[PDB]
Amino acid sequence: PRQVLDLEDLVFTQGSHFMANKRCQLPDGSFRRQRKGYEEVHVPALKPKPFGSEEQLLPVEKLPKYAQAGFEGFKTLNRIQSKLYRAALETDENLLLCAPTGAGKTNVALMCMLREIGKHINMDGTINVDDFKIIYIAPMRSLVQEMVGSFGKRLATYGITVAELTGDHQLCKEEISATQIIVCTPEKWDIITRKGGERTYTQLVRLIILDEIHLLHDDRGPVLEALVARAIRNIEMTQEDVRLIGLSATLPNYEDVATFLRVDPAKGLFYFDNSFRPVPLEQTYVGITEKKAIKRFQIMNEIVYEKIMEHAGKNQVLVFVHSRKETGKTARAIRDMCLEKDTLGLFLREGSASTEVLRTEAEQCKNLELKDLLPYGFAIHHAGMTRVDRTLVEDLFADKHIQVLVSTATLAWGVNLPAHTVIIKGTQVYSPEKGRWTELGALDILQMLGRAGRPQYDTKGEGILITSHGELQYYLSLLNQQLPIESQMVSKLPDMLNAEIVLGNVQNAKDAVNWLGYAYLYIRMLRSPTLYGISHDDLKGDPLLDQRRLDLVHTAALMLDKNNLVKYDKKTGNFQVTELGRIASHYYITNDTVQTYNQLLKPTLSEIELFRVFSLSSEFKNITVREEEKLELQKLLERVPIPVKESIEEPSAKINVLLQAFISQLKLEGFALMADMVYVTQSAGRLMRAIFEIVLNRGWAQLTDKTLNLCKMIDKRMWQSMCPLRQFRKLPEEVVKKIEKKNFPFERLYDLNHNEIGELIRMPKMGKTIHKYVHLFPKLELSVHLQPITRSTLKVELTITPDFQWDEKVHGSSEAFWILVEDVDSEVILHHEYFLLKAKYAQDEHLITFFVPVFEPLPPQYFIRVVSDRWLSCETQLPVSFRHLILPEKYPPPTELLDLQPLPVSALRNSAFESLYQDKFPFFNPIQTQVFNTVYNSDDNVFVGAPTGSGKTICAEFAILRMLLQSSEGRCVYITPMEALAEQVYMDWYEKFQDRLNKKVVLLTGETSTDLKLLGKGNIIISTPEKWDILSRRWKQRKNVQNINLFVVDEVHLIGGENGPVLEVICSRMRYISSQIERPIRIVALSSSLSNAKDVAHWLGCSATSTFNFHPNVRPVPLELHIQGFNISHTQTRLLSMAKPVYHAITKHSPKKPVIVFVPSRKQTRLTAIDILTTCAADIQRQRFLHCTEKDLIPYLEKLSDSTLKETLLNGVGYLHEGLSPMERRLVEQLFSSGAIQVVVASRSLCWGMNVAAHLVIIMDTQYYNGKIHAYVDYPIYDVLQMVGHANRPLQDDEGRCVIMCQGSKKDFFKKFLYEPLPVESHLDHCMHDHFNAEIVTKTIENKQDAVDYLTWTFLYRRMTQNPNYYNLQGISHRHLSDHLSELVEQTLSDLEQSKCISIEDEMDVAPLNLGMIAAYYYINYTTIELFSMSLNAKTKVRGLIEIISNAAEYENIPIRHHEDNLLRQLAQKVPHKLNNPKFNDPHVKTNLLLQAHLSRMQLSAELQSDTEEILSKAIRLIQACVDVLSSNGWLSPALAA
């Protein structure tokens, strides 16, 4: 069905110059006459259309008041504005205003902007800037730069911020965030949207004004085509309306333009022929005929002279030429011609005042050429001369002193200074892109003619146009409303299809065809099949042109696949984005060029070959060597420093020498050569950036260093061997070159004094400025600290310290650096990442942790470099040395799963025991089959390492059953790390054991008083490590804790995480008890597959035979994991970009089965649910995720309180977060379990206390924002493992699928850490103090020798012999181990003594003290009791006591999340007590505010209330501690206040 087309034939070769009408019919009075070697064709001033009987120019006072303030000094509106103000202001439809140039289309654009602005008024205020954004797309950069100022002046009353889109991606995004009116070129907007910088404000973009839209005919027309096509498409799917206002020149095919713009022909369409031009213009066309160009140029000069003499003493003249130098050339030539003919005074007759003003301004002038021409009536105006001089010329012409101005199109574009007469000379321009002489653009001609006739003074403009006889018809049709607009989309279809695929808007050929349907190409092809290579036969065969669109899409995809930009399959017609395609989309580089790069680039390229590869780019395919410049090309070849392998007679060598010359800052002479230089440099910027991205992502250290250096070198226009101070453009070239002559390493200047450097350079006067600049130069200090994690992975913590005084005027808001970790030979990068240093967080350390692989032949060192992304000679390198590195041994293989037969329940002995398993499963899983023979029939300590979801709780139950058989009076204690899981198992075993085996199960709470009774009474004691420690600390007194028969610890693999050391110490204490109390307290440990299981088993006493450690691939239900890299440094941008991939993955992997999506924060959950629903609705499969019908949702939808949650649940997707109440959580969980809703979006923090399993588990952006450091911290691997293990549906699913969408930085880390067991290490050393005081008060520690003995029992000791580097150790020798243990124990004891909790006598004996007694009694931190003791005096009161309690150190773990500051500040002003110097980032002030709010029983947010409950949990014990400490001190009033 699909057929391959010939796009390069289908295109129109002439591009912007192509014509669509074979005829040209002119107005009535349009005679023509052959004068001499040329034909003059005249066309008169079209009379204005008579005013309508019911039409007039309404004053601004008739428009809405919110629209009046935008019109300052305007008493009446133009005819077009008065005609269409109703639609432009009172309606939001899509408009297409076709008006002649210079008629005031900017005023209609202002009308539409005023409409949008007044939609939101801020009645009491003036405006709400941050609720909408308006785009003004103007084609030419100078036009944009003028429109920004004009709009700012017009709307300054509203406070609206008008700004242009310029600079790097980050600068552009910051500008977009700051401003409201964004003025831009179509190319700028397209590139920004392709890179995704505006995805944060697309919704707030409510209105786009496409100025001079007739550009569509131009070679730049495809840019507008894609812009509007994508805008209309996104409006259609996402269903948010953005109003499109297309301002166009009066030209044919405007009905098709309206169709493309979705502009209603009745209401939104308008047409204003040239008659309505405010100053009608008589247009003359002089078409030269002779076929020799020298005579053509001579006749051109004579004709321009003739016309200037025609309008010498009558009207002012604006001559338009192409080149800056040509402006002066022609001005001086005409001056000399009229001087020779003796007609020089006709311009400057004796107008004493004006002529003397001209002469005096000449005497004051600095420009020599303008000084020469100004004494007479002639002036020049080009961008190559001073701003002061050009504004001087402009104001002189406005004063009407200068009678003729020769200028280029730049003036006509960037300045609105019309003249009575305009004279276009030649219309010939040298385009380097086409690399030849070509005709002027339609937009250029229309604009420069719009200057014909000043509305204020002139009643009839006079536009003369001197061109070639052959070219004449083109411009005649142009200016006589006879050149229909025709799309050039066929030329650039492949690149734009690639861009759409990269953006993801198009996924398969069908979506590509749908998008193509919205292109301006589609309408033109439909209307004029012959003009677009289509026969009426094909049109009739395909009325909707679906076949032709499919063929075009097929050919574009074929070319994209051939160049490898996209992975396209002809079978399913689908597309996959390839890194090459993404780079091509981001940097607007043609597909042939990227293929050339992919084929040429090699890892070992030298700087000589780099330039050749760059110059071989297809974007210069047109450029060619012209022998006229070959002598100068040879001179440049000799001068340039980088050799050239190729010969001078090749365009590749030409580009090479041109780029080297631009970098060298040399000065060229040829007009064509220097134009080519400018062109190649402007393209080379992006080309070199793209090459750098390719090489970086491929991982070639030498080549990427070269390419980044070269990009910076091109941008700064200076060689990197120069003095880096040049990068400050404010420094004097004399002093910079003096420094360069005094060649010494630049870093030398840092250590010297300002006088010292001044004397070194021998220039004391600038010495101080040089000191300033050298200190301003960016500079970083690096400090590394690495710990081996396994035999093949290290963890490197790298700290960055700035050393340069930040300054916005030179540095800006942020400075970007690249951190590269590469091997010994610096030939392959091992870890590359971005690093943004913002001004807010300067002069303070930044921690950057990451994992780097290590290979078999242990290299001597790796190199970590940090290189600035913009600045030259801004690098810092650090060698990490693997000289004293001791790699932990290789863990033994996991216990293989023997292929035992299924275990029947009859294998169990007791009928009462079997009863609670008979109906649930006739057979156990192979894991339980394997483990039963040891757990039940054997009494030894047991370990079970199996993947989450294999049923280790069943083995725990087996252990408890065996204990019960031993004796019904036996006692089991089940310790679980987290309280939610503790509650889960409490419910499970209460329903399982007590209700059927009449055995008591009790869950311990945070109250020792009832905990002791429950331990004495019950038979299965569920506990969390802290609740068990508060008891076991006094095990000598408590006999109940001593007489136990089973200790089950669930998931001891959480020992390494936070709150793990408490679990570790309780396990060690229980082992020590079991050793001392004459009766082995058997211990059963359950965990995920641990690589270092032998260490924990040996620590727990488990025998080698009794250690059951399996592999992650031993789960009963297999898993399918997929890691998706998203190389987007900015966190919010990356998050938003992940929205669509969620739906894509849901469709691809789990279309009909349950899916759970884990989101980082509480706010993101609602947004993710809404976005998945929006994309599903955009797809025709709306409500496809509601497996049930709405009938079954009302009973549950009526219980919820969140209307958005109700809407999402009705649509078929639910969500869950801490903000929701447990009631709603349970309802949504039950719905998901039943299958009523397919998709559930859960907060990260709810991954543990979540009672359901799905078929698909998506995880997005595995990082969460910690505001304390103001940085995004990665998910703990324990939490990630839990979340992936949640994809465990035993019977319903044959497999469980999980997709993690993570940055490329964490991609490989997760790939390494998720397919293999999880080595675990202890963190006891940092938190020893609390447990050590507990043990010393218990008297288990009596001397430092006994302290070392006690340490010999913990897990930390076990690892201190296998992975010493993790613990700052330097050897496994007994000497080193003893020294380190003594050091740590002495340090902790000394700190405790300084806190006065203990007393050290003889430096070898230890005893407790009163503060330590209180701390151990009430379970407080020693530092907290210290602060309480010092800060509390005899006169303290509740007002300050609340502050002291808030300062207590137990609350330092209270969460600090984003957006937590503004509402906390709002709270700060309402509590009865005021806080002094409140830093809302501080946990203590946050908790003080929360306590005050709780006391005032005031309304709080859900998460704030949760934090308040967490606070109040321990506030009671803290206040009892206060009471006891004040009792000890003896202060009656403070105790009463407490």
Added chain:
Amino acid sequence: FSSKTEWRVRAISAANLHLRTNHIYVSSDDIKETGYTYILPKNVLKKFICISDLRAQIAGYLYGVSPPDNPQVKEIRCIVMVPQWGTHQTVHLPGQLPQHEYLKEMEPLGWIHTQPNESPQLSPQDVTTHAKIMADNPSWDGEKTIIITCSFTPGSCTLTAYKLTPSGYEWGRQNTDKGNNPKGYLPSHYERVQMLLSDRFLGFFMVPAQSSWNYNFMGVRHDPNMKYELQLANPKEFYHEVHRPSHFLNFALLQEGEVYSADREDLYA
């Protein structure tokens, strides 16, 4: 040297030095079989060959150790590049010997230098240079130190190791003539030692701290008695930009340029 286009042609030729690095030949003959054996890591070998140049000779100091329980062999574990400039038959190293904390553990084993063309005999310049270095510095043991020559044979690098006999040491220390054929230069002054390559470990480099190593384009700044501090990093290529500041700095600034320049707006930026 011509210094006009000779350096350009040489740079073009040297850009392809990484092709030689896969056809390596070792001369195994005349070996006395009684002395040490030497093992050179291929990574440092390839880096050296890549940074080398066809015509000018470069040289660098070797540091190494002996593997445990095997003293009759020596693994070369480090190469030091020092401020130097060399001709097509000699290299002008500085008087100062390398000194650094990491090097304090290894033992100097001599130097390795390139050769534009193969010569079956150690040159008088090489023997006298080694003898002078040994005499001035007591650290160099006359039995452990050697000289490794990498000659650029057609599309290949031929490596050969030579030891300095006591007669050669005395002749070199007493000698002063720097010509191609000094008096008293006999083939009993040197003997060939056994060297071989190894993939089983990786060596590293050490370059000067303040400046780069090569001085061929900045010869006037090279003083034999210059004092330099070492640094742990990798060396640049022979024709790197920093090695020829002259070419890259002697341009002129822009004064009233870009004035008549083509008007082409950077639309995308």
